[PDB]
Design a protein around this ligand. Structure first.
Ligand SMILES: [Cl-]
Ligand SMILES: [Zn+2]
Lengths: 329, 166
């Protein structure tokens, strides 16, 4: 455990040592370095960001005290403190602009023990999508209901979220609908629950009179239960020649011609999934109800002969395998 | 973990969007291949239990999300598929983080967790370094997408395996 904690410290030290000089020059050498982050943001929408070490899964348990102070500073050109731009210990920009995408920030975490850790936060513009399509198949988890997520938000610390279906406000009284954070739960799902769901996320900033509002959309289609069967097709052997390449294709065919309904992979004699590796690699192609995984041998050597390769198709409804043997032609 | 509802189909949606996202033939990018040292050894069910797996998978899911929400990602991939992919992945991450919350001071085998978390972080760090040295070329992005496909597929197969062993 002490070896591990040491490796973790070393890991972040190496990352500090590989920062650009334009970044590391702002760091306080009495502070631990806690990483960098480049967060998504949208023009004309609010933005917020946490200080990386606080959010980091390797360091969270190190700076987990209720009595921590977090300072935010703009760096880059000059070094300026932030007042208006903080909310609940997080960087806060009520209305993100093109100019913000060029700005970056140094956050500093000071513990009561008088220790400190720092992170750097950038942001980049990312057009928020319009409506995202979602399909719920009846019989998936009907007793729980349908969970609609109020889209990816670029800012936390909202006060209120409101849902509309087909531009009509939904009454949230725990019967048909209930809410949990950014989720709308649709109980007793049925085909008629199909529709356009818009959520409006409300933010409050004292320096602004009315509400800041962010909007997201999901187009929900509820469908009947489907037959998710598929069959796998794979030659039982691949004929090879020492010193030559070879390939073999495994095909998954959806019985009801469902699109993108099968996960397929190749696995080597030792159970590991084959990717774009050396010696043997795999490529996937999918169209309509057909999914193909092709396995490639770059240069067959004698060691390969008699090796067995496994093609796996699964989709949470069914899980099937077929194997093929490398045989000398 | 005590979750209201698990949403396995998100994993199927995400992986098939990722498969669909492919734009080039990897046959055009063979010289750009790279062994990233995927830590199979530290993400296998022959020893790893769900208590250790959760926070490690939360980390992998976060790293995957970090790559595909990056500045360079939206130029590299079809926005429609990309937005849908990130939507599925973000929700799984929400759920995984909630589980990580539930087990704050009651961490089981904190050692193997942290050792695994670090191996995962190093792996993705090598991926991001690779991509930067490659100047985010189309072939480097394919190599990364393929690798991420393989990392996610291994995680999904692991989760499937662990749900069978009970
Ligand atoms: Cl689901
Ligand atoms: Zn679900």
């Amino acid at each position: 455990m002490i070896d591990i904690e040491n490796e973790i410290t070393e890991f972040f030290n190496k990352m500090r040592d590989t920062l650009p000089a334009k970044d590391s020059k702002w760091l306080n050498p009495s502070c631990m370095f806690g990483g960098t982050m480049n967060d998504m943001a949208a023009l004309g929408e609010p933005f917020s960001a946490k200080c990386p070490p606080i959010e980091d899964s390797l360091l969270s348990h190190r700076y987990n005290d209720k009595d921590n102070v977090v300072n935010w500073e703009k760096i880059g050109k000059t070094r300026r403190p932030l007042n208006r731009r903080v909310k609940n210990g997080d960087l806060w920009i009520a209305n993100y602009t093109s100019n913000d995408s060029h700005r970056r920030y140094l956050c500093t975490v000071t513990t009561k023990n008088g220790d400190c850790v720092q992170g750097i936060v950038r942001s980049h513009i990312r057009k928020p999508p319009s409506c995202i399509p979602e399909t719920y198949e009846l019989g998936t988890h009907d007793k729980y209901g349908i969970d609609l997520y109020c889209g990816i938000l670029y800012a936390k610390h909202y006060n209120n979220i409101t849902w509309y279906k087909n531009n009509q406000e939904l009454i949230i009284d725990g019967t048909k609908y209930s809410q949990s954070g950014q989720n709308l739960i649709i109980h007793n799902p049925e085909l008629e629950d199909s529709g356009r769901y818009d959520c409006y996320v409300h933010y409050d900033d004292v320096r602004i009179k009315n509400d800041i509002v962010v909007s997201r959309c999901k187009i929900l289609t509820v469908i009947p239960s489907q037959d998710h069967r598929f069959k796998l097709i794979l030659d039982p052997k691949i004929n090879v020649t020492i010193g030559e390449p070879a390939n073999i294709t495994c095909t998954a065919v959806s019985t009801s011609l469902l699109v993108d309904d099968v996960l397929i992979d190749w696995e080597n004699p030792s159970g590991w999934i084959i990717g774009l590796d050396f010696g043997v690699y795999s490529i996937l192609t999918s169209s309509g109800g057909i999914t193909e995984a092709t396995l490639y041998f770059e240069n067959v050597t004698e060691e390969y002969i008699g090796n067995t390769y496994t093609c796996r198709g699964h989709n949470y409804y069914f899980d099937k395998t077929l194997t093929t043997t490398v045989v000398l032609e | 973990c005590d979750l209201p509802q698990t949403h396995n189909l998100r994993n199927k949606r995400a992986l098939t969007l990722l498969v669909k996202m492919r734009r080039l033939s990897p046959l055009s990018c063979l010289k750009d291949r790279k062994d990233f040292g995927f830590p199979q050894e530290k993400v296998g069910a022959q020893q790893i239990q769900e208590a250790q797996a959760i926070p490690v998978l939360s980390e992998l899911t976060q790293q995957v999300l970090n790559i595909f929400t990056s500045k360079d990602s939206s130029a590299a991939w079809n926005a429609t598929l990309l937005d849908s992919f990130c939507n599925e992945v973000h929700q799984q991450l929400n759920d995984l983080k909630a589980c990580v919350m539930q087990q704050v001071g009651v961490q089981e085998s904190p050692l193997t967790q942290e050792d695994s978390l670090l191996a995962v972080r190093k792996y993705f760090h090598r991926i991001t370094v690779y991509l930067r040295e490659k100047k985010h070329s189309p072939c480097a992005w394919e190599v990364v997408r393929a690798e991420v496909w393989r990392a996610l597929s291994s995680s999904v197969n692991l989760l499937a395996r662990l749900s069978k062993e009970e």
